[PDB]
Design a protein around this ligand. Structure first.
Ligand SMILES: CCCc1c(OCCCSc2ccc(CC(=O)O)cc2Cl)ccc2c(C(F)(F)F)noc12
Ligand SMILES: CCCc1c(OCCCSc2ccc(CC(=O)O)cc2Cl)ccc2c(C(F)(F)F)noc12
Lengths: 226, 15, 224, 15
């Protein structure tokens, strides 16, 4: 039963979520696609930081824990936001609310099919659930507040915050989906798949190492092992 | 700490 | 409300679920052999349990193998956490000797993997799950439509729901006042995928130090 | 197939 307090936390999550990028165009056209992709990732991270700051509970965590949680959930939130931009008709993803990218365009940007294919498989699967803005917002809050990330200190409070959002989600989905009692769990199970993708990603970041292809400073910081 | 290692992210969090 | 069909399935699973000994460079090898042989016993157990889960044997044999190959480490990890002793901070296998963080490491495991095993078991043990609940996390773990090489993803996902719903209904009987126990149980499946990947680094480490896994464990775990 | 690359597991599923 959605309480008044949950009602208002969710609306703040939804409201919190509502440009110089090297454009999309041979070693020059190749390095530029990568640069376009990597600069979209940087826009997202910046976007994920300002969103987190608005998460009830987030800025009360110690700064270290804030950085511990955004470090590791940044990719999973990027995959969640990619998944909401998926066009099932052409099997592409519309970034910039403008230009559409497909598996092949992902590969031209430097990424490898071992990661591309799962990205699109996950996006396909998230599309079938047809989540709305609140459900995506709450899933992202839930991903960010994972007590088990490497190096989180106050594990207990991070977990307590995650359950509040988990319950808000439970309550909200009982109003949005009053006959399918599986929609709530089907949404949480997607966080399972995102851990796997976050792992496949680390292999992508390592493949970038071995072919000496430099991430820009902000993403090197969060994704490269120093 | 991670903070010492994550200057850009830390600054995004500060600003 | 727990249906008769969910009731019967839950008892089927519970009923379904119900070696070189432990001692220099040979000392190391016969601990590893004891440890890897304990796993060989678990993988034989998982395969037998799995065969009794409604829907499992109706999947293509290829999909059964897809499911058991990747989910085994995760199920070995759930079972392991059932056996966690919170007082001694140990895991009791076979019902005699109990193993702790350094027994694991004398048995050849790298500390980057042991620490998560025990920290996951400390967390699992805090929820105080009983048999029926472990049995059903194990079923959901197995029926993951997102495993590499699953073909009928739609039916593996459908089968998983029947178990996820079963657990929902059951936990509402087990824990009628705490609506969070059910998603706290599911969320532990999120952590298991990270431990599954921590385990891939372990297995690759064993390659680097040229350690050899036995036939069944090399089969399901080695990257051929 | 996964089946021909997993002969021990397959036989266990068969027996
Ligand atoms: C899912 C992974 C996406 C991903 C990259 O981004 C493509 C889409 C970024 S997510 C994103 C960015 C801006 C907007 C805002 C707007 O639409 O305008 C919306 C979204 Cl959703 C860029 C680089 C990498 C890499 C790597 F390793 F090459 F750096 N791994 O994954 C990457
Ligand atoms: C948890 C996984 C720990 C683990 C191993 O643990 C064996 C003990 C946990 S599995 C297990 C075995 C027998 C029983 C028997 C009973 O209860 O009677 C119950 C369980 Cl749960 C053995 C080998 C490896 C490896 C590797 F690399 F060598 F393959 N990585 O992790 C390993």
């Amino acid at each position: 039963q959605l309480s008044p307090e949950q009602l208002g936390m969710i609306e703040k999550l939804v409201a919190a979520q509502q440009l110089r990028v090297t454009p999309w165009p041979s070693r020059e056209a190749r390095q530029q696609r990568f640069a376009h992709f990597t600069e979209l990732a940087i826009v997202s991270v910046q976007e994920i930081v300002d969103f987190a700051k608005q998460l009830p509970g987030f800025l009360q965590l110690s700064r270290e824990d804030q950085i511990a949680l955004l470090k590791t959930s940044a990719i999973e939130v990027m995959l969640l936001e990619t998944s909401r931009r998926y066009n099932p008709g052409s099997e592409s993803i519309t970034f910039l609310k403008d230009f559409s990218y497909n598996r092949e365009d992902f590969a031209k940007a430097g990424l490898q099919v071992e990661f591309i294919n799962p990205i699109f498989e996950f996006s396909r699967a998230m599309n079938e659930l047809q989540l709305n803005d609140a459900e995506f917002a709450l899933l992202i809050a839930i991903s960010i507040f994972s007590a088990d990330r490497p190096n989180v200190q106050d594990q207990l409070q991070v977990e307590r915050l995650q359950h509040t959002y988990v319950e808000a989600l439970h309550a909200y989905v009982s109003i949005h989906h009053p006959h399918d009692r599986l929609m709530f769990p089907r949404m949480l199970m997607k966080l399972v798949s995102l851990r796997t993708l976050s792992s496949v990603h680390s292999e992508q970041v390592f493949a970038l190492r071995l072919q000496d292809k430099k991430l820009p400073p902000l993403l090197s910081e969060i994704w490269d092992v120093h | 700490s991670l903070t010492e290692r994550h200057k850009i992210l830390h600054r995004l969090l500060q600003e």
